[PDB]
A paper describes a structure:
GluA3, a subtype strongly associated with disease, functions as both a fast-transmitting Ca2+-permeable AMPAR at sensory synapses, and as a Ca2+-impermeable receptor at cortical synapses. Here we present cryo-electron microscopy structures of the Ca2+-permeable GluA3 homomer, which substantially diverges from other AMPARs. The GluA3 extracellular domain tiers (N-terminal domain (NTD) and ligand-binding domain (LBD)) are closely coupled throughout gating states, creating interfaces that impact signalling and contain human disease-associated mutations. Central to this architecture is a stacking interaction between two arginine residues (Arg163) in the NTD dimer interface, trapping a unique NTD dimer conformation that enables close contacts with the LBD.
GluA3-G–TARP-γ2 determined in the apo state diverges from existing AMPAR structures in its sequence-diverse NTD tier. Similar to GluA1 receptors, GluA3 lacks the interface between the inner B and D subunit NTDs that is typically observed in GluA2; as a result, the two GluA3 NTD dimers are separated. Furthermore, the GluA3 NTDs stack onto the LBDs—a close apposition of NTD and LBD is apparent throughout 3D classes, where we observe receptors with two upright NTD dimers, both interfacing with the LBD, or those with one upright dimer and a second one bending towards the LBD. GluA3 with two ‘double upright’ NTD dimers accumulated in the centre of the conformational landscape, while receptors with bent NTDs localized to the periphery. Interface contacts are established exclusively with the LBDs of the A/C subunits (but not with the gating-dominant B/D LBDs), resulting in an outward translation of the NTD dimers that underlies the expanded appearance of the receptor. We measured a >20 Å translation of the inner NTDs towards an A/C LBD, when comparing GluA3 with either a GluA2 homomer or a GluA2/3 heteromer, using the GluA3 marker residues Arg183 (NTD) and Tyr471 (LBD) and the corresponding markers in GluA2.
Residue numbers in the entry:
A (entry chain C): 539 to 554, 570 to 635
B (entry chain Z): 6 to 39, 56 to 70, 73 to 83, 93 to 161, 174 to 210
C (entry chain D): 789 to 828
D (entry chain B): 587 to 634
Write the structure that this text describes.
């Protein structure tokens, strides 16, 4: 969230009315909606903001798939035991 | 503006001192080892219940690289250095009121210090792979404070350039 | 059985590397635009 | 949100964003639990 806000808002040349909607509070919302994969309000448009978003998306995909897979492993193994 | 600068300076000093204390002290992990309950930091392991004399941690291709990175503790030390540089940038910006890029430099330093702290935490936990002592949480609190101070410094940079716009 | 940080350390490394890359790209663009505005 | 499908509108205030965000966490831990338990039931026929 901090890096997204930094790369989205720091440059005065982008401001020349904010250049985009990604303040720190909005960066914290975009980032949480992404982690939950239940987010659709505003999407970064600059190159660096899209780098941050895509890498966070990959992190989220891997982590959520890992959570589901390990929960399935726990439940299956406890059904196996006798 | 003055209140924001005071918050930024105090937070910069707090995060730097927290990270320095965490790197210096030996309460990073409560575990069991040479066969006694001990607490270890990044450099020394000492027993709780000899009560106090320490050992240098025996830190020793991907595994070798991870062990070298852990042994040098390059990332927590780099975080300390970047926090110090951010504080120096804050002081220099106090000296030079017209150069707004010094505030931006300080913010970049603080955010980079937080990122280096994240890397160091991950490296430490992986190398360890018990309980975590107060030096670990001092480092974590240093990361949180560093990111907050970086956000606040970026806000000061944005506000100053907005003021030049008008 | 709870999968540990070593199981997903690489994705954390990729994430922090991408954050650093985005910071570098934004700063390079800012420096280029600063030089261009100095020229113009 | 629960169906993991769409938004149309998103909360903008702090409290709404708090309500939305704890619903998003519930929707993710419940739907992962459903899928994991269905996989466990299909893999192992613990059979009375």
């Amino acid at each position: 969230s901090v890096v997204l806000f930094l790369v989205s808002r720091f440059s005065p040349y982008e401001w020349h009315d904010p250049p985009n909607e990604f303040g720190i509070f909005n960066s914290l919302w975009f980032s949480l909606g992404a982690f939950m994969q239940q987010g659709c309000d505003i999407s970064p448009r600059s190159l660096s903001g899209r780098i941050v978003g895509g890498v966070w998306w990959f992190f989220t995909l891997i982590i959520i798939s890992s959570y589901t897979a390990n929960l399935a492993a726990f439940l299956t193994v406890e059904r196996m035991v006798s | 503006r003055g209140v924001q600068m005071l918050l930024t300076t105090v937070g910069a000093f707090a995060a730097f001192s927290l990270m320095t204390i965490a790197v210096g002290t030996d309460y990073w992990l409560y575990s069991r080892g040479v066969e006694v309950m001990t607490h270890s930091g990044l450099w020394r392991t000492c027993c709780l219940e000899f009560k106090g004399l320490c050992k240098q941690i025996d830190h020793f291709t991907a595994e070798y690289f991870l062990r070298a990175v852990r042994a040098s503790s390059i990332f927590p030390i780099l975080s300390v250095i970047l926090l110090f540089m951010g504080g120096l940038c804050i002081a220099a910006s106090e000296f030079y009121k017209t150069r707004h890029n010094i505030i931006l430099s300080a913010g970049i330093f603080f955010v980079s210090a937080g990122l280096s702290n994240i890397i160091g935490i991950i490296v430490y936990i992986s190398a360890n792979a018990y309980s975590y002592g107060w030096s670990f949480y001092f480092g974590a609190l240093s990361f949180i404070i560093a990111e907050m101070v970086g956000v606040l410094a970026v806000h000061m940079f944005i506000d100053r350039h907005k003021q030049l716009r008008a | 059985s709870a999968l540990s940080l070593s199981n997903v350390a690489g994705v954390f490394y990729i994430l922090v590397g991408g954050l650093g890359l985005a910071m570098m790209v934004a700063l390079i663009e800012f420096c280029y635009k600063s030089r261009a505005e100095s020229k113009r």
